């Protein structure tokens, strides 16, 4: 147990840019040892609401694989991201499943994702015909036919663009300030669980 092959947890967190909430990024981590301590190396106020597992007893037990997803959302949306809660972003973008066993880390990023004129690099979906199944990716940019009459691919009355951008400015309050969220979802399969945590002495 030389403790040498650490997991690449820096790329997920220490990233210059984060993917939009409507099109999030998925990365798999395997064949390494976790270093959850680094989790509290930074950020002033960073919640760790681990549902389904003991928040402080995760190092000891070994897991088959871990999945990492990340995005950027508003203030109340970090509350809306809790499993089982119903919300427009919740039922239109991510839709965490009810039987979820993983942690959710949400931290303020006003210093790193706010523009004086107003940022336009972040988009989020407004409305969809049907709700999303858990762990589903939607990147469709087609027009929306709210009514029965076809839109024929042109905007106007009863035909709206599905994606609306945010506007992050420093003058806004805490509720409208940007927040970065990363979710870790653990899994257990027939594999020999090569994601064993650190061992001491």
């Amino acid at each position, epitope marked *: 147990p030389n403790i040498t092959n650490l997991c690449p947890f820096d790329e997920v967190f220490n990233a*210059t840019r984060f993917a939009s909430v409507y099109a999030w990024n998925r990365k798999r981590i395997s064949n390494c040892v976790a270093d959850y301590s680094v989790l509290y190396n930074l950020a002033p106020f960073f919640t760790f609401k681990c549902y389904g597992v003991s928040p402080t007893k995760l190092n000891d037990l070994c897991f088959t694989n871990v999945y990492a997803d990340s995005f950027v959302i508003r203030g109340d949306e970090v509350r809306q991201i809790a499993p089982g809660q119903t919300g427009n972003i919740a039922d239109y973008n991510y839709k965490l499943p009810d039987d979820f066993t993983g942690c959710v880390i949400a931290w303020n990023s*006003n*210093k*790193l994702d*706010s523009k*004086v004129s107003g*940022n336009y*690099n972040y988009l989020y979906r407004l409305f969809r015909k049907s709700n999303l199944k858990p762990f589903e990716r939607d990147i469709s940019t087609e027009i929306y036919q709210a009514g029965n009459k076809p839109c024929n691919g042109v905007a106007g009355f009863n035909c709206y663009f599905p994606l609306r951008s945010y506007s992050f400015r420093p003058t806004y309050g805490v509720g409208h300030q940007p927040y970065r969220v990363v979710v870790l979802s653990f899994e257990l399969l027939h594999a020999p669980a090569t994601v064993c945590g650190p061992k001491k002495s």
Partner: antibody
Amino acid sequence: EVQLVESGGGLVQPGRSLRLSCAASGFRFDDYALHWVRQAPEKGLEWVSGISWNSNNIGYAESVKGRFTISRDTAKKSLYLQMNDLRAEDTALYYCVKDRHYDSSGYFVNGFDIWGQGTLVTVSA
Amino acid sequence: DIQLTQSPSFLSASVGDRVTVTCRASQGISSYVAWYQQKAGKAPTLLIYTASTLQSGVPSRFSGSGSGTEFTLTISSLQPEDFATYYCQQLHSYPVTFGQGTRLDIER
């Protein structure tokens, strides 16, 4: 190591177009923003052009607006500055500088990090 | 655009002295400013951004402060390597423009 190489400079008669090329080494080309900044001899510095990550936010200085064009290619990691309607003000040394926050001014953290050696452009008949 | 002005243009200095340069704007640009040092015939290098946050590998003699429309840079101790030209850059609006520049001088 991070390095920037600029090419295409020299001497240009007025009324003749030119293209300046900038290549990068040692960092992710399509995740960082870049700027072109010119300097006249013993005249301090002056911003010329800037570009962003996905070609969404681009703007030119009003002094040279409408005569220069910036373009970026991540396939070969190149930045092109196309010149048009050159006048006596264009003779200068050009630096292809790299920004450290994927976007132009407005964010809390911003700064020109890596400055190339620049290329010399002279304009006369 | 935004106009930036530095009051003392030329400052003769010697080793171990204290030097302060002031760069001020017209409209309040919050704290989106930076300082650059250009050597003799060399590409300028960044020293400080946001007027308080040192970037990396910069000697501790360099320091800065600023609020509202005032921004002041200071060097605690001077070495022969520090004699160069100094520029201040604003970053509030998009049409970024630098200052007229300030160059330190030796003392005879």
